[PDB]
Amino acid sequence: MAQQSPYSAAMAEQRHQEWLRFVDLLKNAYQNDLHLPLLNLMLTPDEREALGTRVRIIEELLRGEMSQRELKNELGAGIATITRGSNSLKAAPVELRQWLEEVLL
Amino acid sequence: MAQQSPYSAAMAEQRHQEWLRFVDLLKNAYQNDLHLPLLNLMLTPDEREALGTRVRIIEELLRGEMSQRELKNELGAGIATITRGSNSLKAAPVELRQWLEEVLL
């Protein structure tokens, strides 16, 4: 099978453990109301600003997709209503259709 | 007083709100067991690795300071014990000092 040298396996295992220890360290900082000073210790001012900007970009990407999905579903529902209205008019009883023309003058 | 243009005040207020929204977004992700995929969305693999490495550097800096503080307190306690032992020997009754020399042969 696709294996790897014991050097690369140790580097990947240390990299994994170091990342898990960061996530757990920040989790306990949130539970002790100490996440704000820890983030200032872990991140430079430019890196914190980059993270805030990335949150805005994600919001702008999600809202752009949502409005695009709503526009697609609105046009599809509008077409579905026209086709369903046409079929319902052709399937309607003649008494109803005869009366609908009289209201149209 | 030291004020600032309304442009810079708006940029600083947006920067502040964007950072607060990131901290709150990650806090709710920890409470929903969704912090791991959110961090992968917010951070590239190199940036996550850098954060794990920074946690190890902080541990190595703190342990280096702790062992240096323990070495300083041990040497100070050792000197304090010698000076306190010397004073206690000179303040001891003569009956005790006379007997301590006899045990020394």
Numbering used by the authors:
A (entry chain A), B (entry chain A): 1 to 105
Which passages does the manuscript contain on this structure?
Tryptophan repressor (TrpR) was one of the earliest gene-regulatory proteins for which a high-resolution crystal structure was determined in complex with its DNA regulatory site. The TrpR dimer is formed from deeply intertwined monomers and is related to domain-swapped proteins, even though it does not meet a proposed definition predicated on the existence of a stably folded monomeric structure, which TrpR apparently does not have. Formation of the extended domain-swapped structure depends on the conversion of two interhelical turns in each subunit of native dimeric TrpR into helical segments, resulting in the formation of a continuous, nearly straight α-helix of 47 residues. TrpR crystals in the typical native dimeric form have previously been reported for a variant in which Val58 is replaced by isoleucine (Val58Ile), one of 19 TrpR mutants created by Arvidson et al. to explore the role of the identity of the residue at position 58, which forms part of the l-Trp-binding site.
Hereafter, the Val58Ile TrpR protein after protease cleavage is referred to as cleaved. The structures of free and l-Trp-soaked cleaved Val58Ile ds-TrpR were determined to 2.05 and 2.45 Å resolution, respectively, and refined to an R work/R free of 26.8/29.9% and 27.8/29.1%, respectively. A clear example of this effect is illustrated by the common observation of components of crystallization solvents in seemingly well localized sites on protein surfaces, as for iPrOH in the l-Trp site of the l-Trp-free ds-TrpR structure here, which has a B factor similar to those of its surrounding residues, as does l-Trp in the l-Trp-soaked structure. The structures of cleaved Val58Ile ds-TrpR with and without soaked l-Trp have only minor differences in overall structure (r.m.s.d. of 0.56 Å for all non-H protein atoms). The results presented here demonstrate that the structure of domain-swapped Val58Ile TrpR is also essentially identical to that of wild-type ds-TrpR.
